[model samples]
Target: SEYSLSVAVLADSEIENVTQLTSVTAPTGTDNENIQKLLADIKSSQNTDLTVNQSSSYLAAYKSLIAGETKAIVLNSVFENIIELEYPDYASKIKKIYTKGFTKKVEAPKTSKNQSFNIYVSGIDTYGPISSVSRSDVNILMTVNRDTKKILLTTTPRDAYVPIADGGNNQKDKLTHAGIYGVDSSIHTLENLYGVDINYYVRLNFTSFLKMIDLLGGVDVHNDQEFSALHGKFHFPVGNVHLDSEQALGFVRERYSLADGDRDRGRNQQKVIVAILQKLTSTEALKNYSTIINSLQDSIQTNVPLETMINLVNAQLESGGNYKVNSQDLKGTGRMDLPSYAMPDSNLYVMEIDDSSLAVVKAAIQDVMEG
Candidate 1:
């Protein structure tokens, strides 16, 4: 969820009644400075006399305030959802004085609403809470042209051996590991490889991915070949298959049991992405705006502004036609002996990018964007 601060008191209490509060609980340490700064701003805006000291523990402050130990407490607004879920009665007892939100500015894309733009969708290999550093297992460039109603999705293998941006000494490493440096590194790596400028990126991990699938009420994925997944032994037929969260995870994560290993896995990832896009854009799915936003906020991180997304949606609705979707997979050969900066001594499997394949993908992106 987005970060913000809320000043809350009991439902029966008024702002004036809480103005003379002797103690108010807030976060401590470096965060304490930020909390103090925010409180200072709030104090000036609300024109209230309130003094507070940093609480070493936010939970303690919340508990003390809720139990009537203190008049008020300042905390992150995200915890409001947790309270609503775990203690519904507790949520009903509190009223917000005001909420202060902070959002950084993002540079908009070069093209207008009707032109073409590029977005890099990255799925990292991690469990639990999402973080900046991890192996980006899924990489796909999504090119959208609003006027033409066209979208071209191009997939690059996780194991693709390439030079990572801002990597020390300019040594080559697995494309997946570029995520360790940061999403910018991943974008830069792909930019260097494909000669395409990525305007935005969306990132998510396994936990978020499953949650999204469940929110979508599952999706229908097309399988090119019949195979059973290694972890779950879930049987996948050579045709269209409807998948739940677990089934979909197995479908996308499995590579050992496939005939062509990671190459087939890359293809499956692309297929899953296409299935999700189709599901999201469908009339039925579009109706559940709240569910989609909640699911996305928790599980996904993107540089694209909320306004841009809304404009894109409006563009789609106004066009009154489906996007002509296309997909391309970067072909490469696997090599166990390939030298890698991330793995020096081990003979780990890596996908050696074919020059011809790179040329084909580069030209494809250029043609789509410049068309």
Candidate 2:
């Protein structure tokens, strides 16, 4: 599992007092593996000694810290919203002393020039620094074929009502909400839905997406219909269109004003992804390779290692062929009464998965992998 822990202190506190963290609180009941690991990291890297305390509840930890019962607190970044909602003044009262993310390495399936594999590209909906938990607005499964140099990007609607992997009794939830359980659940949920083995994942937020496109100068996206985006208010014309960072974001994100709603949004997301892939392989991008790499290093996290990327790039360049990028968006009917694991109070809008369409998609993925 991939996790990020935040070292929190009172706002306006001195950094030097981080070592003075004599007592810290965490949500009670669960094992303190995250807290213990973080403390170890702090002691080893920052030379800060710390101790641990357990709070009866998640919010109680913050309350205890605020009451001077504990010197410091370690909390999950996911709880930021809860703090804001419950305390209102929590953000102004606390400061994040440090935050670090780590992932448990998975042994990826070995692939050669003739092999194929699937990668899950998750676009988390957030800005600024990346956190472990968020609704994955963009979900793309990229099936890469090394032999034929063909890539298939299959997009799933975020609101698709599907069974969430490892979700207890009530497992049915919107696909987007799977990220709340963690990346492992998200990957497993997709795997279960599509009956495909997902070997790896690459995660990024909106900020990273905009920064990436801007760093690449811009991408050439093909728009089917002429329309102005509702989010950015940028007018887009039909045919091949050039998009900057802001325009590209608007292009992918606007579905509210479109006729098909989330279905059209899924197609748009695929368009932007295919455009970015084309831009990355262009001669101009090759010239600015170093800058592009540095920009991605900070913004993106992938189970694919540095050497794995280098190997893949080397193989593709040595093969000396243009990779074909194909895309497909799943078609589904809308439903409002579907049960959602994330939302308990009321019925939420969801996409009922189309079995016939999914069969075609499954065959498409199988054909590429077998080839």
Clashes of 2: 0
lDDT for 52 (candidate 1): 72
Lowest summed lDDT window (length 10), candidate 2: 77-86
- What TM value does model 1 have? 0.68
Estimate, for each residue in 74-191, the C-alpha lDDT of model 2 and write its tens digit.
8765445435435768878888877878676654644434488899999998887766357888889999888777889999899888888743122677888776666667788888
Q: lDDT: which candidate is best?
A: 2
lDDT (Cα, 0-100) at 210 in candidate 2 = 88
Tens digit per residue, CA lDDT, model 1, 1-371:
23577777777875544455555677554246547666777668766655676654444556677888777887665434323323458667778766778553444444434378899999988888876346788989998776677788998998888887753124576888777556777888888889877888999999989999998888898799988885556999999899998899889989887898877887888788888988888766665654687767977888877787776666656555787888898888888988765555458778888999999999998788776
Which prediction has the highest TM-score against the true structure? Answer: 2
